[PDB]
Scaffold this active site. Structure first.
Site, short mmCIF file in Angstrom:
data_model
loop_
_atom_site.label_atom_id
_atom_site.label_comp_id
_atom_site.label_asym_id
_atom_site.label_seq_id
_atom_site.Cartn_x
_atom_site.Cartn_y
_atom_site.Cartn_z
N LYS A 54 -15.53 20.41 26.12
CA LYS A 54 -14.19 20.77 26.58
C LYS A 54 -13.19 19.62 26.41
O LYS A 54 -11.98 19.84 26.33
CB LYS A 54 -14.25 21.20 28.05
CG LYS A 54 -13.26 22.28 28.46
CD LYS A 54 -13.67 22.88 29.80
CE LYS A 54 -12.85 24.10 30.16
NZ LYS A 54 -13.28 24.68 31.46
N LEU A 56 -12.98 17.57 23.81
CA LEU A 56 -12.53 17.45 22.44
C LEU A 56 -11.33 18.35 22.18
O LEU A 56 -11.28 19.48 22.67
CB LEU A 56 -13.66 17.79 21.46
CG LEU A 56 -14.98 17.04 21.68
CD1 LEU A 56 -16.00 17.42 20.62
CD2 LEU A 56 -14.76 15.53 21.71
N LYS A 66 -18.94 29.41 25.70
CA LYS A 66 -19.91 29.92 24.73
C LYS A 66 -20.97 28.86 24.43
O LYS A 66 -22.12 29.18 24.14
CB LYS A 66 -19.22 30.36 23.44
CG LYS A 66 -18.32 31.58 23.62
CD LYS A 66 -17.86 32.14 22.28
CE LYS A 66 -16.93 33.34 22.46
NZ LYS A 66 -15.55 32.92 22.84
N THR A 95 -16.13 41.04 1.85
CA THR A 95 -15.02 40.10 1.67
C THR A 95 -15.42 38.88 0.85
O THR A 95 -14.58 38.04 0.53
CB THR A 95 -14.46 39.62 3.02
OG1 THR A 95 -15.48 38.91 3.74
CG2 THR A 95 -13.96 40.79 3.85
N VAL A 97 -16.41 39.20 -2.08
CA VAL A 97 -15.93 39.55 -3.41
C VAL A 97 -14.47 39.15 -3.56
O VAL A 97 -13.63 39.51 -2.74
CB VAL A 97 -16.07 41.06 -3.69
CG1 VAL A 97 -15.62 41.38 -5.11
CG2 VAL A 97 -17.51 41.51 -3.47
N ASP A 184 -13.63 25.48 -7.52
CA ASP A 184 -12.94 25.92 -8.72
C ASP A 184 -12.21 24.75 -9.38
O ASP A 184 -12.41 23.60 -9.01
CB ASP A 184 -11.97 27.06 -8.40
CG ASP A 184 -10.76 26.60 -7.59
OD1 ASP A 184 -10.74 25.46 -7.09
OD2 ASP A 184 -9.82 27.41 -7.44
N1 LIG Z 1 -4.89 28.16 2.61
C1 LIG Z 1 -4.75 27.21 1.73
C2 LIG Z 1 -5.39 27.27 0.53
C3 LIG Z 1 -5.23 26.27 -0.39
N2 LIG Z 1 -4.42 25.21 -0.07
C4 LIG Z 1 -4.21 24.10 -1.04
C5 LIG Z 1 -5.04 22.94 -0.71
C6 LIG Z 1 -6.20 23.13 -1.50
O1 LIG Z 1 -6.58 21.86 -1.75
C7 LIG Z 1 -5.60 23.70 -2.73
C8 LIG Z 1 -6.56 24.56 -3.66
O2 LIG Z 1 -7.38 25.59 -3.15
P1 LIG Z 1 -8.61 25.63 -3.38
O3 LIG Z 1 -9.10 25.45 -4.69
O4 LIG Z 1 -8.93 26.70 -2.81
N3 LIG Z 1 -9.42 24.28 -2.38
P2 LIG Z 1 -9.86 23.18 -2.91
O5 LIG Z 1 -9.71 22.99 -4.33
O6 LIG Z 1 -9.63 22.21 -1.96
O7 LIG Z 1 -11.28 23.25 -2.71
P3 LIG Z 1 -12.43 24.00 -3.41
O8 LIG Z 1 -13.02 25.09 -2.82
O9 LIG Z 1 -12.14 24.37 -4.63
O10 LIG Z 1 -13.47 23.27 -3.67
O11 LIG Z 1 -4.50 24.40 -2.34
C9 LIG Z 1 -3.83 25.19 1.10
O12 LIG Z 1 -3.11 24.29 1.38
N4 LIG Z 1 -3.97 26.15 2.02
MN LIG Z 2 -8.10 27.11 -6.29
MN LIG Z 3 -10.07 24.14 -5.76
NA NA Z 4 -12.59 38.35 -0.83
NA NA Z 5 -9.81 20.44 24.85
#
Ligand SMILES: Nc1ccn([C@H]2C[C@H](O)[C@@H](COP(=O)(O)NP(=O)(O)OP(=O)(O)O)O2)c(=O)n1
Ligand SMILES: [Mn+2]
Ligand SMILES: [Mn+2]
Ligand code: NA
Ligand code: NA
Length: 326
Positions: A54, A56, A66, A95, A97, A184
DNA sequence: CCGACATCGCATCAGC
DNA sequence: GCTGATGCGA
DNA sequence: GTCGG
């Protein structure tokens, strides 16, 4: 910290996070659970009580409650119940997919479509993005070794300059943060004949070239500034590489560094930087930083000639990409 | 007792 | 035909 | 769900 110190708890919170995200359609609860899981993951003691956790930041009454049930009994009845629930499990799984969110997953499940095989039996009912996400379901959940990311970078950097010598492609995302593997590839594209004050088909030609050399294989979404798609390294008759996700973004070249900053991330980091900024009288996005005013009415935007510039405006210590995990 | 927790691009849907 | 809302995603 | 108005 050794992940087994509070691994039972962090797992529990992460499952709850995913369920709130995918089934309850509550992104902020998903974020709350994530935040609570993350901060506990850094806690260098083994938690004995909910009231202890609690303390943190991000852990309040409900989660502390929980944790108490988990420690005292070894499980969470709400989580046990969710897991055996056919509907919640199917909705949650679907989800995974690409293209299928909580809304589509719920409607699919509502009409009896619950597995991958069900989706394959029903191509009609899927849109273009979803079909692709289904086709490369396994591949998109594979992680990409940094060595392959370098191989993918070479191709992009090559073909980019081949179209026009003054493009500037910059791989951002987890790769730029130096991660040993990535989800990616995120490419940030800039060109002199494209400014905030301001040659049209600037993004289209690059994409077309990467299709030309058979590097880009599929399109999820394409426009003037944004590309979402699929790529594949060419095989060395030795076996074939997995299909990978690739995001490309064409950005105002005079805003290059706010974009490099945003699309390098991380996810929580970009969020912490914007929220900090506000407590300190600033507001950042992917383009600008601008001192909100006195009244908190944004003033004009600033010059930024390196990533560190932005770090200076609100003056955090310039953290290397490797350090921006949160 | 209750609103923020960021905002955007593109595909697609709801509706004029 | 169009604009605007929603979904999904970065 | 948590924090803080
Ligand atoms: N909700 C989100 C999604 C992405 N982003 C930004 C920061 C992420 O570094 C970037 C790219 O998305 P991303 O590829 O999904 N993540 P990121 O490359 O960090 O990590 P990975 O999953 O690919 O490894 O966009 C964000 O700021 N808020
Ligand atoms: Mn991306
Ligand atoms: Mn990425
Ligand atoms: Na999805
Ligand atoms: Na707290």
């Amino acid at each position: 910290p050794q992940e087994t110190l509070n691994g039972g708890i962090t797992d529990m919170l992460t499952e709850l996070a995913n369920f709130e995200k995918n089934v309850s359609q509550a992104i902020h609860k998903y974020n709350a659970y994530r935040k609570a899981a993350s901060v506990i993951a850094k806690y260098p003691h083994k938690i004995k009580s909910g009231a202890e956790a609690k303390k943190l930041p991000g852990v309040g009454t409900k989660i502390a409650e929980k944790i108490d049930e988990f420690l005292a009994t070894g499980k969470l009845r709400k989580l046990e119940k969710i897991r055996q629930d056919d509907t919640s499990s199917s909705i949650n799984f679907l989800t995974r997919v690409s293209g299928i969110g909580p809304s589509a997953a719920r409607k699919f499940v509502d009409e009896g479509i619950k597995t991958l095989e069900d989706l394959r039996k029903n191509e009609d009912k899927l849109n273009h993005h979803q079909r692709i996400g289904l086709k490369y379901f396994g591949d998109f959940e594979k992680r990409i070794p940094r060595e392959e990311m370098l191989q993918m970078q070479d191709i992009v950097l090559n073909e980019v300059k081949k179209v026009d010598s003054e493009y500037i492609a910059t791989v951002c995302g987890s790769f730029r943060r130096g991660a040993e593997s990535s989800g990616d590839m995120d490419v940030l594209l800039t060109h002199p004949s494209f400014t905030s004050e301001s040659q049209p088909k600037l993004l289209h030609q690059v994409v077309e070239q990467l299709q030309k050399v058979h590097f880009i294989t599929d399109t999820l979404s394409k426009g003037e500034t944004k590309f979402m798609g699929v790529c594949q390294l060419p095989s060395k008759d030795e076996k074939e590489y997995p299909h990978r996700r690739i995001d490309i973004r064409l950005i105002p070249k005079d805003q290059y560094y706010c974009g490099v900053l945003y699309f390098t991330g991380s996810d929580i980091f970009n969020k912490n930087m914007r929220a900090h900024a506000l407590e300190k009288g600033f507001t950042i996005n992917e383009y600008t930083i601008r001192p909100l005013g006195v009244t908190g009415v944004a003033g004009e935007p600033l010059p930024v000639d390196s990533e560190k510039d932005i770090f200076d405006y609100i003056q955090w210590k310039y953290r290397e990409p490797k350090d921006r995990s949160e």
